[PDB]
């Protein structure tokens, strides 16, 4: 049957894509042909596939334990790996180490879904960053499945990614290359899965998203991701995403810009007693505080470039630091109205009484306050 040879690092990388993205369902399928080696893993929600160059001494197919194949290739020294299917066993040899693994019948393995037509392409680093930015805001409760997604809206060369759990809403807009300028799309993708794909290290320069084209967008029920000989499909969520754009204020009664690193550290510091952190903004300074006399109190004053009348507002400290870490900028702008209404966080890189117009950014993190005791 199948017999091949390739370098361990290459082998581990291909198996790695399939492992990071995923009885008979415990197997991965190895296929050898003129196009080298393909590794396929099937799951009913997500399928993944990786193709690499290899010496195909003899072509064929074999089905082996995915978990075991991953553990082995990860542990193997960085040397050539030889794989020989002899009977219902697979011999794997690398240096002086020899493995003999049981197989399963290949005809039992379910067919992997076909990817939809390509919809567009963006750089892989941008894809990775944008998904990790918005994924932090998704709900993780399956009784509210409409929150467990990342919304992908495609309007020509513009992509808008959004996620919310009813308390924070994260939105990232970016430019990419579409299959056509009038391509239109809104789909909802499971956040955990998509976040996983984005950080699984596809490698190379490109990420291609496949949802179909024209009226057949989303019709397959699948998001395809591909690039660098790798590809995967993910089942789309059926739920509707909330209308979020009208929640974006056009002006603010007060605006605060601060240093991101030092606010995050102060929050971690003061939250050591609490829940909620409270923020008392005034011209030039903000007092960040937490706790109660029964368990202990903490507070710290921070420098702030502040426009507007003093405002006292409170936040879930975890949601607040999530937002600050999603900015990827040295400074943050807070856009406020009242203490019971969303705060708008925007990345900032290093006049009168108001109201103050919102400054447009390609990223926003909208955060609902919590009520003061």
């Amino acid at each position: 049957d199948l017999t091949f040879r390739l370098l361990r690092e290459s082998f581990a990388d291909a198996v790695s894509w399939v492992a990071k993205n995923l009885p008979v369902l415990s197997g991965v399928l190895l296929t050898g042909s003129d196009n080298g080696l393909t590794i396929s893993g099937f799951d009913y929600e997500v399928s993944a596939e990786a193709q690499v160059g290899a010496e195909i001494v003899s072509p064929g197919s074999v089905l082996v334990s995915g978990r075991l194949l991953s553990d082995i290739t990860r542990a193997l020294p960085n040397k050539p790996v030889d794989v020989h299917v002899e009977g219902n066993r697979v011999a794997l040899t690398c240096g002086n180490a020899r493995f003999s693994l049981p197989t399963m019948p290949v005809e039992d393995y379910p067919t992997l879904p076909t990817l939809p037509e390509e919809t567009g392409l963006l750089p892989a680093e941008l894809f990775a960053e944008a998904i990790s930015q918005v994924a932090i805001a998704a709900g993780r409760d399956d009784t509210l499945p409409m929150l467990t997604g990342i919304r992908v809206e495609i309007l020509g060369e513009t992509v808008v990614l959004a996620a919310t759990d009813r308390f924070r809403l994260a939105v990232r807009e970016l430019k990419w290359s579409a299959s056509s300028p009038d391509i239109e799309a809104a789909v909802l993708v499971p956040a955990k899965t998509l976040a996983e794909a984005a950080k699984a290290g596809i490698g190379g320069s490109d990420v291609r998203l496949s949802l179909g084209t024209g009226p057949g967008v989303g019709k397959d029920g699948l998001l395809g991701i591909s690039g660098n000989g790798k590809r995967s499909t993910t089942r789309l969520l059926d739920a509707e995403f909330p209308k979020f754009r009208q929640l974006l204020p056009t002006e603010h009664t007060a605006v605060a810009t601060m240093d991101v690193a030092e606010l995050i550290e102060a929050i971690k510091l003061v939250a050591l007693v609490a829940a909620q952190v409270r923020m008392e903004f005034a011209d030039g300074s903000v007092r960040l505080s937490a706790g109660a006399d029964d368990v202990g109190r903490a507070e710290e004053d921070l420098v702030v470039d502040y426009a507007g009348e003093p405002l006292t507002i409170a936040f879930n400290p975890t949601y607040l630091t999530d937002g600050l870490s999603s900015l990827r900028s040295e400074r943050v702008s807070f856009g406020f109205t009242t203490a019971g209404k969303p705060a708008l966080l925007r990345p900032v890189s290093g006049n009168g009484n108001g109201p103050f117009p919102a400054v447009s950014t390609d990223y926003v993190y909208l955060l609902m306050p919590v009520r003061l005791p």
């Binding site: 919310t164 009813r166 308390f167 924070r168 809403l169 909330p242 209308k243 979020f244 929640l247 879930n316 019971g340 969303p342 909208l366 609902m368 306050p369 919590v370 009520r371």
Partner: peptide
């Protein structure tokens, strides 16, 4: 702990 004023949603 109010939600965001998502309509519908909250």
């Amino acid at each position: 702990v109010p939600t965001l004023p998502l309509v519908p949603x909250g």
